[PDB]
Design a binder for this molecule. Structure first.
Ligand code: COH
Ligand SMILES: CC(C)C1=CC2=CC[C@@H]3[C@](C)(CCC[C@@]3(C)C(=O)N[C@@H](Cc3c[nH]c4ccccc34)C(=O)O)[C@H]2CC1
Length: 454
């Protein structure tokens, strides 16, 4: 039975001021480097424990002992993602109902059906870049977000945000981003009911209304038409949970759509942005991935099968997920009194935070080179111990979108590497901006066309 380390305290505010920062995940990583595999974090009226080691996270991932907790971050997002899959408790009837209905819509097999719509958006990204003039550069996170948002819009509910036709996001996106920013800011806001925050609350309600209005209208229009499409909204209007025999109601479908649109934004586009960052910083790795793309993508437009045979591109994406997982933490609660790692007694209800970027730098798993970008780490995945690699979270509460996110990312990166040579023309210095997600802020490149027609 061991005493848990704790970072520096601030009198009555305990550890709370350590998260008064624009880069809290990066701050928590530096604390874990100091204190090790577990530390207690106290604030007025709360305590959580940050885990960093495969040794302890493997136990945290035991679903008989720990279930998904809603972090305060998830509680603030629930104000507009409701009881969709991401912001629901496991015990809420709408979680297991939506999970049973949606799982078949998100399988590897279902990706054959979305492939043509994903190609639509990937081809718009390639044409944009083919159409840049000689002096011009690419705003990498900006264009990856254009693609990932439009891909989930079109595959989700046959809706075109037409992001590649715009400088200003679509109205829905400006409201969604400002709602997400507001939810994230409330984490650091003392005395939120202070009348100084009156204007935030009125703006928050307006943005929730914008989102509900557009999504409720797309649902009503689809039901009003009877159209059957290749999209999640068809699967949700038609589907019945085999357990309860019930369908989702229109309110819950709205929450699922809002949830997928949150995910399909900078959380997916972050993976592509980090991947391209690592590739331009590791020209030998970029060359190997470009060689695979030229070898495999022999057709004007890539096939589902051809994306599956981009094995080294998939390893590149897993290595980017290792170093900078774009959904960098998740929360758990103890189902019963239990002892973590033979050393740390927990009571029923006690919270754990999994610090994924820190798990992914466990030298006992990965060896001494943990800071190196080496996709070849992933050549034999059977060698990876249980729960060592967790960018999509854990168990029944793992990312439902994982096969979607990886198919889109492998397709797009494949096509980028087939069509263009890349230049790190600014010698970009990595600056990771933390919102809901992580991104390489200001990451810019030049793309020189290889002049291969679509
Ligand atoms: C279109 C939908 C979609 C996409 C593209 C997507 C793409 C990605 C993505 C891209 C690289 C990453 C790193 C993640 C990472 C995660 N996703 Co998603 N997710 C998506 C839909 C979801 C949903 C829905 C959940 C909740 C699943 C559940 O609990 O039933 C989810 C859960 C997660 C969790 C668990 C959170 C927790 O609190 O435990 C992580 C981590 N993620 N996701
Ligand atoms: C919505 C999804 C995509 C997200 C999940 C997250 C999980 C953990 C979060 C998060 C990374 C944002 C920064 C704080 C952090 C690390 C956290 O521990 N947060 C704890 C502890 C905490 C911080 N501030 C608080 C204020 C009140 C209560 C708890 C807290 C929490 O939210 O619960 C955040 C990103 C957004």
């Amino acid at each position: 039975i061991k005493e848990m380390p704790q970072p520096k305290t601030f009198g009555e505010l305990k550890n709370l001021p350590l998260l008064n920062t624009d880069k809290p995940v990066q701050a928590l990583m530096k604390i874990a480097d100091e204190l090790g595999e577990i530390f207690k974090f106290e604030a007025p009226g709360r305590v959580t424990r940050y885990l960093s080691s495969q040794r302890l996270i493997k136990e945290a991932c035991d679903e008989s002992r720990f279930d998904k907790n809603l972090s305060q971050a998830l509680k603030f997002v629930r104000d507009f993602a409701g009881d969709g899959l991401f912001t629901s408790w496991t015990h809420e009837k709408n979680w297991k109902k939506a999970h049973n209905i949606l799982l078949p819509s998100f399988s590897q097999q279902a990706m054959k059906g979305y492939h043509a719509m994903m190609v639509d958006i990937a081809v718009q990204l390639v044409q944009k870049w083919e159409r840049l003039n000689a002096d011009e550069h690419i705003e990498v996170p900006e264009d990856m977000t254009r693609l990932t948002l439009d891909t989930i819009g079109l595959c989700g509910f046959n809706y075109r945000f037409n992001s590649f036709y715009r400088d200003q996001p679509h109205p829905f996106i400006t409201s969604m981003v400002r709602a997400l920013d507001e939810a994230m800011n409330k984490l650091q806001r003392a005395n939120p009911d202070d009348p100084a925050y009156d204007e935030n609350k009125r703006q928050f309600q307006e943005d929730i209304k914008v989102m509900n209005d557009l999504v409720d209208k797309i649902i009503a229009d689809r039901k009003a038409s009877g159209e059957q499409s290749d999209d999640l909204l068809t699967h949700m209007l038609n589907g019945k949970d085999p357990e309860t025999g019930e369908p989702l109601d229109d309110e819950n479908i709205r929450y699922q759509i809002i949830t997928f649109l949150i995910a399909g934004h900078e959380t997916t586009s972050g993976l592509l942005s980090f991947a391209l960052y690592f590739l331009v910083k590791n020209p030998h790795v970029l060359q190997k991935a470009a060689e695979e793309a030229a070898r495999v993508l022999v057709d004007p437009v890539p096939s589902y099968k051809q994306v599956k045979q981009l094995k080294y591109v998939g390893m590149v994406l897993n290595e980017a997920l290792r170093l900078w997982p774009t959904a960098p933490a998740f929360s758990l609660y103890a189902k019963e009194d239990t002892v973590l790692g033979g050393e740390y007694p927990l009571e029923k209800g006690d919270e754990l935070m999994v610090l994924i970027p820190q798990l992914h730098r466990d030298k006992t798993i990965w060896g001494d080179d943990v800071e190196e970008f080496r996709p070849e780490r992933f050549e034999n995945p059977s060698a990876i111990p249980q729960h060592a690699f967790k960018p999509f979270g854990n168990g029944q509460r793992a990312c439902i979108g994982q096969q979607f996110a990886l198919h889109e990312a492998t397709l797009v990166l494949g096509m980028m590497l087939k069509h263009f040579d890349f230049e790190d023309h600014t010698n970009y210095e990595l600056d990771i901006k933390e919102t809901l997600t992580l991104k390489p802020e200001g990451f810019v490149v030049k793309a020189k066309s290889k002049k291969i027609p679509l």
